[PDB]
Amino acid sequence: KRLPLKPVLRIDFPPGERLGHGKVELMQLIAETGSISAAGRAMDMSYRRAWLLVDALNHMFRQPVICSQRGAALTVFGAELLERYRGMEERMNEALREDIDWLEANRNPQ
Amino acid sequence: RLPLKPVLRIDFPPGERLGHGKVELMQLIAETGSISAAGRAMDMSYRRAWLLVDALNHMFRQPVICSQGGAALTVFGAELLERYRGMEERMNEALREDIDWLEANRNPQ
């Protein structure tokens, strides 16, 4: 047995930016641990590199995505962004289902 | 001003992926007729380009690229590439309302 074929989504924010697995995982991990340093640790990166992803997220949109507290959290908007990316993933999977079947039939068994 | 754009990659567990690098490589083989010209276009060594070709020719039940120097897509390969373009369109259409919501919340800057 191996795992199924799986589409993965990223969205380009031209010119400089992206929203994909790395920023979504950070967001999910902030929702779960309440900590930027913990999320960075989980993802095997320095606090600097993690914090720069946070900083990117807080300048990509009209509202902040992550905020401090008494020490981090998703804002109302951040939670909305995360749910909408999850929905996009679901919608993409639905749309590509037949294409995946064709890839799967054509995939080398080994 | 530039538009948000969803991008597709497909995981081939374990360890493999079909995304922008391999698709760009297929598209370049089609346009140039050679692996080496395609590697140069992507700014990678021939060796790296040849390993992408080799990975593609082992992901599926038949080869994607064949020697034509020279190289071309096989009929299956040309269909794979057309299929990925179809998947991109299908994804763009399914995500259209979502991309709009992203555009509306985007930083004016």
PDB file of C-alpha atoms in Angstrom:
ATOM      1  CA  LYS A   1       0.000   0.000   0.000  1.00  0.00           C
ATOM      2  CA  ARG A   2       1.054   3.554  -0.613  1.00  0.00           C
ATOM      3  CA  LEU A   3      -0.842   6.711   0.064  1.00  0.00           C
ATOM      4  CA  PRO A   4      -3.333   8.068  -2.472  1.00  0.00           C
ATOM      5  CA  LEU A   5      -2.479  10.777  -5.010  1.00  0.00           C
ATOM      6  CA  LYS A   6      -3.254  14.102  -3.498  1.00  0.00           C
ATOM      7  CA  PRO A   7      -3.661  17.614  -4.979  1.00  0.00           C
ATOM      8  CA  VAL A   8      -2.126  20.496  -2.951  1.00  0.00           C
ATOM      9  CA  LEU A   9      -3.023  24.139  -3.383  1.00  0.00           C
ATOM     10  CA  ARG A  10      -0.996  27.310  -3.073  1.00  0.00           C
ATOM     11  CA  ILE A  11      -2.120  30.822  -4.034  1.00  0.00           C
ATOM     12  CA  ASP A  12       0.287  33.283  -5.540  1.00  0.00           C
ATOM     13  CA  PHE A  13       0.078  36.837  -4.134  1.00  0.00           C
ATOM     14  CA  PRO A  14       2.106  38.687  -6.840  1.00  0.00           C
ATOM     15  CA  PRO A  15       4.674  40.051  -6.966  1.00  0.00           C
ATOM     16  CA  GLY A  16       6.381  38.844  -3.823  1.00  0.00           C
ATOM     17  CA  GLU A  17       4.060  36.568  -1.918  1.00  0.00           C
ATOM     18  CA  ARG A  18       2.510  33.127  -1.465  1.00  0.00           C
ATOM     19  CA  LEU A  19      -0.138  31.470   0.682  1.00  0.00           C
ATOM     20  CA  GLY A  20       0.283  27.756   0.896  1.00  0.00           C
ATOM     21  CA  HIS A  21       1.219  24.854   3.051  1.00  0.00           C
ATOM     22  CA  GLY A  22       3.797  26.688   5.141  1.00  0.00           C
ATOM     23  CA  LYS A  23       1.646  29.636   6.170  1.00  0.00           C
ATOM     24  CA  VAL A  24      -1.495  27.535   6.659  1.00  0.00           C
ATOM     25  CA  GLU A  25       0.333  25.071   8.879  1.00  0.00           C
ATOM     26  CA  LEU A  26       1.764  27.954  10.954  1.00  0.00           C
ATOM     27  CA  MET A  27      -1.771  29.341  11.361  1.00  0.00           C
ATOM     28  CA  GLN A  28      -3.177  25.915  12.307  1.00  0.00           C
ATOM     29  CA  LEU A  29      -0.332  25.432  14.775  1.00  0.00           C
ATOM     30  CA  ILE A  30      -0.877  28.888  16.311  1.00  0.00           C
ATOM     31  CA  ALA A  31      -4.567  28.027  16.750  1.00  0.00           C
ATOM     32  CA  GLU A  32      -3.484  24.818  18.476  1.00  0.00           C
ATOM     33  CA  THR A  33      -0.591  25.885  20.711  1.00  0.00           C
ATOM     34  CA  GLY A  34      -1.103  29.640  21.001  1.00  0.00           C
ATOM     35  CA  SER A  35       2.596  30.178  20.339  1.00  0.00           C
ATOM     36  CA  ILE A  36       4.736  31.393  17.398  1.00  0.00           C
ATOM     37  CA  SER A  37       7.897  29.883  18.853  1.00  0.00           C
ATOM     38  CA  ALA A  38       6.148  26.480  19.260  1.00  0.00           C
ATOM     39  CA  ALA A  39       4.819  26.547  15.684  1.00  0.00           C
ATOM     40  CA  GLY A  40       8.338  27.458  14.379  1.00  0.00           C
ATOM     41  CA  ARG A  41       9.838  24.622  16.427  1.00  0.00           C
ATOM     42  CA  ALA A  42       7.235  22.186  15.046  1.00  0.00           C
ATOM     43  CA  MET A  43       8.119  23.249  11.509  1.00  0.00           C
ATOM     44  CA  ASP A  44      11.881  23.054  12.112  1.00  0.00           C
ATOM     45  CA  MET A  45      12.700  26.715  11.617  1.00  0.00           C
ATOM     46  CA  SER A  46      14.119  29.533  13.669  1.00  0.00           C
ATOM     47  CA  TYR A  47      11.836  31.952  15.484  1.00  0.00           C
ATOM     48  CA  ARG A  48      13.048  34.580  12.961  1.00  0.00           C
ATOM     49  CA  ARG A  49      11.839  32.516   9.973  1.00  0.00           C
ATOM     50  CA  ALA A  50       8.522  31.707  11.618  1.00  0.00           C
ATOM     51  CA  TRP A  51       8.000  35.308  12.738  1.00  0.00           C
ATOM     52  CA  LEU A  52       8.725  36.555   9.186  1.00  0.00           C
ATOM     53  CA  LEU A  53       5.859  34.283   7.966  1.00  0.00           C
ATOM     54  CA  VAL A  54       3.613  35.863  10.625  1.00  0.00           C
ATOM     55  CA  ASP A  55       4.749  39.287   9.517  1.00  0.00           C
ATOM     56  CA  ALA A  56       3.984  38.401   5.876  1.00  0.00           C
ATOM     57  CA  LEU A  57       0.457  37.257   6.896  1.00  0.00           C
ATOM     58  CA  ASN A  58      -0.113  40.500   8.795  1.00  0.00           C
ATOM     59  CA  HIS A  59       0.662  42.620   5.749  1.00  0.00           C
ATOM     60  CA  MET A  60      -0.970  40.542   2.983  1.00  0.00           C
ATOM     61  CA  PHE A  61      -4.546  41.453   3.958  1.00  0.00           C
ATOM     62  CA  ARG A  62      -6.528  44.496   5.107  1.00  0.00           C
ATOM     63  CA  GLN A  63      -6.755  43.080   8.608  1.00  0.00           C
ATOM     64  CA  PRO A  64      -4.066  41.279  10.707  1.00  0.00           C
ATOM     65  CA  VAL A  65      -4.171  37.462  10.685  1.00  0.00           C
ATOM     66  CA  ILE A  66      -2.281  36.823  13.929  1.00  0.00           C
ATOM     67  CA  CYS A  67      -2.097  38.927  17.097  1.00  0.00           C
ATOM     68  CA  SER A  68      -0.463  38.910  20.524  1.00  0.00           C
ATOM     69  CA  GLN A  69      -2.276  38.101  23.756  1.00  0.00           C
ATOM     70  CA  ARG A  70      -1.465  37.465  27.453  1.00  0.00           C
ATOM     71  CA  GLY A  71       1.277  34.618  23.545  1.00  0.00           C
ATOM     72  CA  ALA A  72      -0.251  34.460  20.036  1.00  0.00           C
ATOM     73  CA  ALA A  73      -3.677  33.914  18.430  1.00  0.00           C
ATOM     74  CA  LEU A  74      -5.624  34.024  15.169  1.00  0.00           C
ATOM     75  CA  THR A  75      -7.738  37.147  14.761  1.00  0.00           C
ATOM     76  CA  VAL A  76     -11.419  36.798  13.748  1.00  0.00           C
ATOM     77  CA  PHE A  77     -10.143  37.404  10.186  1.00  0.00           C
ATOM     78  CA  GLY A  78      -7.308  34.881  10.643  1.00  0.00           C
ATOM     79  CA  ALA A  79      -9.771  32.168  11.629  1.00  0.00           C
ATOM     80  CA  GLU A  80     -11.862  33.128   8.599  1.00  0.00           C
ATOM     81  CA  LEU A  81      -8.790  32.890   6.322  1.00  0.00           C
ATOM     82  CA  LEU A  82      -7.956  29.437   7.675  1.00  0.00           C
ATOM     83  CA  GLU A  83     -11.559  28.132   7.178  1.00  0.00           C
ATOM     84  CA  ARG A  84     -11.724  29.550   3.685  1.00  0.00           C
ATOM     85  CA  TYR A  85      -8.422  27.845   2.748  1.00  0.00           C
ATOM     86  CA  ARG A  86      -9.847  24.565   4.104  1.00  0.00           C
ATOM     87  CA  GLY A  87     -12.957  25.106   1.976  1.00  0.00           C
ATOM     88  CA  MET A  88     -10.851  25.832  -1.093  1.00  0.00           C
ATOM     89  CA  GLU A  89      -8.960  22.592  -0.521  1.00  0.00           C
ATOM     90  CA  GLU A  90     -12.287  20.693  -0.359  1.00  0.00           C
ATOM     91  CA  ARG A  91     -13.612  22.411  -3.482  1.00  0.00           C
ATOM     92  CA  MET A  92     -10.415  21.647  -5.365  1.00  0.00           C
ATOM     93  CA  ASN A  93     -10.543  17.971  -4.362  1.00  0.00           C
ATOM     94  CA  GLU A  94     -14.169  17.707  -5.534  1.00  0.00           C
ATOM     95  CA  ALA A  95     -13.389  19.372  -8.872  1.00  0.00           C
ATOM     96  CA  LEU A  96     -10.303  17.284  -9.580  1.00  0.00           C
ATOM     97  CA  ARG A  97     -11.740  13.904  -8.530  1.00  0.00           C
ATOM     98  CA  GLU A  98     -12.026  12.467 -12.041  1.00  0.00           C
ATOM     99  CA  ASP A  99      -8.562  13.784 -13.005  1.00  0.00           C
ATOM    100  CA  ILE A 100      -7.057  12.107  -9.975  1.00  0.00           C
ATOM    101  CA  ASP A 101      -8.752   8.825 -10.958  1.00  0.00           C
ATOM    102  CA  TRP A 102      -7.091   9.068 -14.353  1.00  0.00           C
ATOM    103  CA  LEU A 103      -3.682   9.766 -12.798  1.00  0.00           C
ATOM    104  CA  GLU A 104      -4.286   6.934 -10.386  1.00  0.00           C
ATOM    105  CA  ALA A 105      -5.098   4.458 -13.175  1.00  0.00           C
ATOM    106  CA  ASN A 106      -1.906   5.603 -14.963  1.00  0.00           C
ATOM    107  CA  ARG A 107       0.357   5.605 -11.944  1.00  0.00           C
ATOM    108  CA  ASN A 108       3.140   3.059 -11.945  1.00  0.00           C
ATOM    109  CA  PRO A 109       2.338   0.242  -9.441  1.00  0.00           C
ATOM    110  CA  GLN A 110       5.945  -0.849  -8.557  1.00  0.00           C
TER     111      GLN A 110
ATOM    112  CA  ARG B   1      -2.649  45.155  -9.396  1.00  0.00           C
ATOM    113  CA  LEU B   2      -1.573  41.653 -10.518  1.00  0.00           C
ATOM    114  CA  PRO B   3      -4.214  38.958  -9.920  1.00  0.00           C
ATOM    115  CA  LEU B   4      -4.104  36.190  -7.269  1.00  0.00           C
ATOM    116  CA  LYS B   5      -3.556  32.831  -8.894  1.00  0.00           C
ATOM    117  CA  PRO B   6      -4.116  29.345  -7.484  1.00  0.00           C
ATOM    118  CA  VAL B   7      -1.355  26.866  -8.218  1.00  0.00           C
ATOM    119  CA  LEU B   8      -1.633  23.088  -8.343  1.00  0.00           C
ATOM    120  CA  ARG B   9       0.877  20.361  -7.414  1.00  0.00           C
ATOM    121  CA  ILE B  10      -0.006  16.682  -7.128  1.00  0.00           C
ATOM    122  CA  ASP B  11       1.623  14.453  -4.543  1.00  0.00           C
ATOM    123  CA  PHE B  12       2.785  11.031  -5.657  1.00  0.00           C
ATOM    124  CA  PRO B  13       3.495   9.347  -2.308  1.00  0.00           C
ATOM    125  CA  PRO B  14       5.995   8.505  -1.152  1.00  0.00           C
ATOM    126  CA  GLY B  15       8.649  11.081  -2.076  1.00  0.00           C
ATOM    127  CA  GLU B  16       7.425  12.159  -5.552  1.00  0.00           C
ATOM    128  CA  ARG B  17       5.480  15.241  -6.783  1.00  0.00           C
ATOM    129  CA  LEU B  18       4.050  16.453 -10.103  1.00  0.00           C
ATOM    130  CA  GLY B  19       3.994  20.208 -10.175  1.00  0.00           C
ATOM    131  CA  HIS B  20       5.450  23.283 -11.733  1.00  0.00           C
ATOM    132  CA  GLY B  21       9.041  21.999 -12.202  1.00  0.00           C
ATOM    133  CA  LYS B  22       8.107  18.822 -14.052  1.00  0.00           C
ATOM    134  CA  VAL B  23       5.270  20.477 -15.992  1.00  0.00           C
ATOM    135  CA  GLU B  24       7.542  23.372 -17.019  1.00  0.00           C
ATOM    136  CA  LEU B  25      10.118  20.795 -18.102  1.00  0.00           C
ATOM    137  CA  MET B  26       7.512  18.934 -20.216  1.00  0.00           C
ATOM    138  CA  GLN B  27       6.390  22.203 -21.730  1.00  0.00           C
ATOM    139  CA  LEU B  28      10.025  23.109 -22.552  1.00  0.00           C
ATOM    140  CA  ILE B  29      10.802  19.707 -24.097  1.00  0.00           C
ATOM    141  CA  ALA B  30       7.788  20.246 -26.312  1.00  0.00           C
ATOM    142  CA  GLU B  31       9.032  23.726 -27.311  1.00  0.00           C
ATOM    143  CA  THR B  32      12.768  23.044 -27.759  1.00  0.00           C
ATOM    144  CA  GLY B  33      13.005  19.363 -28.585  1.00  0.00           C
ATOM    145  CA  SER B  34      15.775  18.717 -26.047  1.00  0.00           C
ATOM    146  CA  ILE B  35      16.431  17.915 -22.381  1.00  0.00           C
ATOM    147  CA  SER B  36      19.539  19.995 -22.320  1.00  0.00           C
ATOM    148  CA  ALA B  37      17.839  23.073 -23.765  1.00  0.00           C
ATOM    149  CA  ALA B  38      15.072  22.608 -21.163  1.00  0.00           C
ATOM    150  CA  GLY B  39      17.551  22.368 -18.284  1.00  0.00           C
ATOM    151  CA  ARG B  40      19.280  25.531 -19.446  1.00  0.00           C
ATOM    152  CA  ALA B  41      15.913  27.306 -19.664  1.00  0.00           C
ATOM    153  CA  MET B  42      15.176  26.365 -16.069  1.00  0.00           C
ATOM    154  CA  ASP B  43      18.673  27.319 -15.003  1.00  0.00           C
ATOM    155  CA  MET B  44      19.543  23.863 -13.718  1.00  0.00           C
ATOM    156  CA  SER B  45      22.349  21.464 -14.621  1.00  0.00           C
ATOM    157  CA  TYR B  46      21.726  18.822 -17.280  1.00  0.00           C
ATOM    158  CA  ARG B  47      22.078  16.215 -14.596  1.00  0.00           C
ATOM    159  CA  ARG B  48      19.156  17.654 -12.539  1.00  0.00           C
ATOM    160  CA  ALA B  49      17.026  18.014 -15.702  1.00  0.00           C
ATOM    161  CA  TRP B  50      17.797  14.405 -16.670  1.00  0.00           C
ATOM    162  CA  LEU B  51      16.780  13.220 -13.202  1.00  0.00           C
ATOM    163  CA  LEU B  52      13.422  15.032 -13.527  1.00  0.00           C
ATOM    164  CA  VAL B  53      12.946  13.319 -16.892  1.00  0.00           C
ATOM    165  CA  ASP B  54      13.846   9.994 -15.308  1.00  0.00           C
ATOM    166  CA  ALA B  55      11.438  10.505 -12.406  1.00  0.00           C
ATOM    167  CA  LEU B  56       8.628  11.358 -14.863  1.00  0.00           C
ATOM    168  CA  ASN B  57       9.445   8.251 -16.942  1.00  0.00           C
ATOM    169  CA  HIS B  58       9.002   6.120 -13.846  1.00  0.00           C
ATOM    170  CA  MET B  59       5.926   7.693 -12.224  1.00  0.00           C
ATOM    171  CA  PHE B  60       3.512   6.197 -14.747  1.00  0.00           C
ATOM    172  CA  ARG B  61       2.899   2.887 -16.503  1.00  0.00           C
ATOM    173  CA  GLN B  62       4.679   4.139 -19.592  1.00  0.00           C
ATOM    174  CA  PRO B  63       7.217   6.795 -20.502  1.00  0.00           C
ATOM    175  CA  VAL B  64       6.344  10.485 -20.574  1.00  0.00           C
ATOM    176  CA  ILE B  65       9.410  11.627 -22.600  1.00  0.00           C
ATOM    177  CA  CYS B  66      11.383   9.746 -25.216  1.00  0.00           C
ATOM    178  CA  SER B  67      14.583  10.466 -27.107  1.00  0.00           C
ATOM    179  CA  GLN B  68      13.851  11.953 -30.536  1.00  0.00           C
ATOM    180  CA  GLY B  69      20.363  14.475 -29.631  1.00  0.00           C
ATOM    181  CA  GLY B  70      16.625  15.030 -29.182  1.00  0.00           C
ATOM    182  CA  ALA B  71      13.603  14.510 -26.963  1.00  0.00           C
ATOM    183  CA  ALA B  72       9.827  14.683 -27.323  1.00  0.00           C
ATOM    184  CA  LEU B  73       6.729  13.969 -25.344  1.00  0.00           C
ATOM    185  CA  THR B  74       5.235  10.561 -25.983  1.00  0.00           C
ATOM    186  CA  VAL B  75       1.540  10.474 -26.836  1.00  0.00           C
ATOM    187  CA  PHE B  76       0.847   9.701 -23.177  1.00  0.00           C
ATOM    188  CA  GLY B  77       3.166  12.564 -22.136  1.00  0.00           C
ATOM    189  CA  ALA B  78       1.379  15.102 -24.325  1.00  0.00           C
ATOM    190  CA  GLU B  79      -1.874  13.918 -22.763  1.00  0.00           C
ATOM    191  CA  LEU B  80      -0.520  14.162 -19.267  1.00  0.00           C
ATOM    192  CA  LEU B  81       0.444  17.819 -19.951  1.00  0.00           C
ATOM    193  CA  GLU B  82      -2.965  18.551 -21.497  1.00  0.00           C
ATOM    194  CA  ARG B  83      -4.584  16.861 -18.515  1.00  0.00           C
ATOM    195  CA  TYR B  84      -2.683  19.016 -16.067  1.00  0.00           C
ATOM    196  CA  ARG B  85      -3.756  22.159 -18.011  1.00  0.00           C
ATOM    197  CA  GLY B  86      -7.371  20.876 -17.718  1.00  0.00           C
ATOM    198  CA  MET B  87      -6.939  20.357 -13.974  1.00  0.00           C
ATOM    199  CA  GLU B  88      -5.669  23.920 -13.596  1.00  0.00           C
ATOM    200  CA  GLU B  89      -8.768  25.256 -15.390  1.00  0.00           C
ATOM    201  CA  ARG B  90     -11.111  23.058 -13.361  1.00  0.00           C
ATOM    202  CA  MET B  91      -9.421  24.237 -10.201  1.00  0.00           C
ATOM    203  CA  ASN B  92      -9.581  27.910 -11.290  1.00  0.00           C
ATOM    204  CA  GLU B  93     -13.341  27.590 -11.885  1.00  0.00           C
ATOM    205  CA  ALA B  94     -14.092  25.772  -8.620  1.00  0.00           C
ATOM    206  CA  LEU B  95     -12.073  28.349  -6.672  1.00  0.00           C
ATOM    207  CA  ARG B  96     -13.370  31.429  -8.395  1.00  0.00           C
ATOM    208  CA  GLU B  97     -15.680  32.749  -5.600  1.00  0.00           C
ATOM    209  CA  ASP B  98     -12.833  32.053  -3.100  1.00  0.00           C
ATOM    210  CA  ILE B  99     -10.215  33.880  -5.106  1.00  0.00           C
ATOM    211  CA  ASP B 100     -12.660  36.791  -5.225  1.00  0.00           C
ATOM    212  CA  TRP B 101     -12.996  36.809  -1.439  1.00  0.00           C
ATOM    213  CA  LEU B 102      -9.165  36.768  -1.185  1.00  0.00           C
ATOM    214  CA  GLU B 103      -8.964  39.678  -3.687  1.00  0.00           C
ATOM    215  CA  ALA B 104     -11.468  41.660  -1.626  1.00  0.00           C
ATOM    216  CA  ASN B 105      -9.480  41.141   1.604  1.00  0.00           C
ATOM    217  CA  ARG B 106      -6.091  41.788  -0.039  1.00  0.00           C
ATOM    218  CA  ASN B 107      -3.945  44.668   1.204  1.00  0.00           C
ATOM    219  CA  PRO B 108      -4.478  47.688  -1.140  1.00  0.00           C
ATOM    220  CA  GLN B 109      -0.780  48.144  -0.174  1.00  0.00           C
TER     221      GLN B 109
END
